[PDB]
Design a protein around this ligand. Structure first.
Ligand SMILES: O=c1ccn([C@@H]2O[C@H](CO)[C@@H](O)[C@H]2O)c(=O)[nH]1
Length: 121
């Protein structure tokens, strides 16, 4: 009766601000986990008032901007962003993202769009 396994085939998959998201559909108040694929960048800056965003970099190389501070990131690195921190990133990377407490779109806040020319990837 209990669903333990979620697959890519059954996931919701869409593009948002230059990234390709795989949202498995996990429901759990403690955290939710998604895949993020980025070719050149996440061309938007945002923050989340409630949840920490933890990015594990599966492959590739990029750079996060966290409250405007550059944080280089590469394969096998863990990037740990606390709540209420402005986020954007450039790069060519495959990542696994944890949002803890569970992602709620109501908690996210748009700061600005970013020109695609700003990414050096
Ligand atoms: O369940 C989730 C988790 C993350 N994201 C999005 O993934 C990006 C993470 O950088 C942000 O645009 C964030 O809103 C979603 O859309 N849904």
């Amino acid at each position: 009766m209990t669903k333990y396994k979620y697959t890519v085939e059954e996931s919701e998959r869409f593009n948002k601000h230059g990234i390709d998201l795989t949202v498995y559909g996990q429901v759990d108040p403690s955290a939710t986990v998604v895949r993020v694929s980025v070719e050149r960048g996440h061309f938007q800056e945002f923050f989340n008032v409630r949840s920490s965003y933890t990015y594990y970099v599966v492959s590739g190389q990029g750079v996060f901007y966290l409250n405007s501070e550059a944080v280089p990131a590469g394969a096998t690195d863990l990037i740990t962003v606390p709540p209420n921190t402005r986020i954007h990133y450039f790069g060519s990377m495959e990542m696994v993202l944890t949002v803890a407490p569970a992602f709620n779109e109501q908690d996210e806040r748009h700061v600005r769009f970013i020109s695609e020319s700003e990414s050096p990837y």
